[PDB]
Amino acid sequence: DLLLDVITWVGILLSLVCLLICIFTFCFFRGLQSDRNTIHKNLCISLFVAELLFLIGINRTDQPIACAVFAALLHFFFLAAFTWMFLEGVQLYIMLVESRRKYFYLVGYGMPALIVAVSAAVVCWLRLDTYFIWSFIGPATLIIMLNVIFLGIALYKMFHHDNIKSWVIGAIALLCLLGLTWAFGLMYINESTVIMAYLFTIFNSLQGMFIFIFHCVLQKKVRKEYGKCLRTHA
Numbered sequence: 001d002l003l004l005d006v007i008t009w010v011g012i013l014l015s016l017v018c019l020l021i022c023i024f025t026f027c028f029f030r031g032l033q034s035d036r037n038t039i040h041k042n043l044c045i046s047l048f049v050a051e052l053l054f055l056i057g058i059n060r061t062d063q064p065i066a067c068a069v070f071a072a073l074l075h076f077f078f079l080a081a082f083t084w085m086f087l088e089g090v091q092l093y094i095m096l097v098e099s100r101r102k103y104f105y106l107v108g109y110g111m112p113a114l115i116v117a118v119s120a121a122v123v124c125w126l127r128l129d130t131y132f133i134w135s136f137i138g139p140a141t142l143i144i145m146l147n148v149i150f151l152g153i154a155l156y157k158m159f160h161h162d163n164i165k166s167w168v169i170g171a172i173a174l175l176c177l178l179g180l181t182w183a184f185g186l187m188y189i190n191e192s193t194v195i196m197a198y199l200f201t202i203f204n205s206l207q208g209m210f211i212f213i214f215h216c217v218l219q220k221k222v223r224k225e226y227g228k229c230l231r232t233h234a
Contacts, residue, residue, distance in 0.1 A: 001059075001192045004188075004192055004194065004197055004198060005058070007198060007201045008058075008188065008197075008200070008201050008204075009055070010201065010205075011200075011201030011202060011203075011204040011205045012051055012054060012055050012201070012204055013055075014204070014205045014208055014209075015047075015051050015204040015205065015207060015208030016048060016051050016052065016055075016208070017208075018208035018209060018211060018212035019044045019047055019048045019051070019208055019211055019212070020048065021212055021216070022044070022211075022212055022215070022216035022217075022222070023041070023044045023045060023048060025216060025222055025225075025226065026038075026040055026041035026044065027041055029222070029225045029226075029229070031221075031225050032221060032222060032225055035091055035095075035099070035100065035101070035104070036088070036091055036092075036095075036167075038101050038104060038105075039084060039087050039088045039091055039104060039108070040088065040215055042080075042084050042104075042105070042108055042109075043081060043084040043085060043088065044211065046077050046080040046081040046084055047081050047211070049073070049077045050074060050077040050078055050081060051204070053070060053073050053074045053077065054074065054185070056070070057070035057071075057074065057124045058124070058189070059123065059124065059189075060124060061123065061124050067124040070124045071124055071125060071126055072116060072120065074124075074125060075116060075125075075126060075136060076112050076113070076116045077112075078140070078182065079111075079112040079115060079116075079136075079139060079140055079143075080108065080109060080112040081178070082140055082143050082144060082147075082178070083107065083108055083111050083112060083143055084108045085147055085171065085174070085175055085178070086107075086143050086146065086147045086150075087104050087107055087108050088147075088171055089147045089150035089151050089154070089168075089171060090150060091104075092150070092151070092154055092164060092167055092168050092171060093150050093153060093154045095164060096154050096157065096158065096164050115139060119132060119135060119136075123189050123190055125186070125189045125190075128186075128190050144175065144179065147175060148172070148175065151168055151171055151172045151175070154168050155168050155169070155172070170210075170214045170215065173210065173214075174207075174210055174211065174214070174215075177203070177206060177207045177210055178207060180203055181200065181203035181204055181206075181207045184196040184197060184199055184200035184203060185200050185203075185204075187200070188200045
């Protein structure tokens with residue numbers, strides 16, 4: 001398990017850095033700020049927190065009180081990131097049919113918050129032996145599928161009838177990347193097979209890679225603003 005952990009540190013750190021490079025460029029710039037800059041900022045914040053909590057809580061169950069906090073925080077932030085891409089798909093559909101910053105914050109964090117508190121009322125990730133690992137997976141898979149539903153609706157609308165097209169293609173690719181990353185991420189925790197846990201590292205490296213290359217340098221708006229700042233400063 002120790003040998004595989006060496007590889008995971010490389011990938012998770014790369015995901016943390018690649019998110020970090022454009023976690024602030026979503027708030028450090030006063031031009032980009034919009035309804036797709038708050039969703040894409042909270043998404044990176046949630047993924048950053050999830051990655052950091054993973055790196056600090058892979059198996060450290062020596063302190064039970066710390067393990068419980070680790071588990072609750074990770075279970076909250078995973079579904080927070082997933083519902084934030086839900087809100088990203090909803091926003092991409094709305095900007096296709098045609099400031100709600102706090103109301104996206106309400107759906108983006110309230111729904112994960114509602115589940116965690118209610119579920120708690122009834123390895124440091126969770127008990128994967130039935131009980132309510134399925135009660136976690138249910139909402140997660142449901143919102144992933146329904147985000148796919150919106151992404152497909154928008155893509156089909158545009159295709160049979162731009163920049164929204166590129167954004168929804170990037171969003172569906174990013175959602176598939178989260179799927180194929182945090183599917184092995186929930187396998188690296190209860191076991192240590194090199195067959196999937198090792199590829200979990202490269203999927204984190206690609207997940208962060210896509211977040212940093214599509215939504216931070218290939219939008220022709222973040223790149224232009226960063227170039228403006230760079231050229232003006234010196």
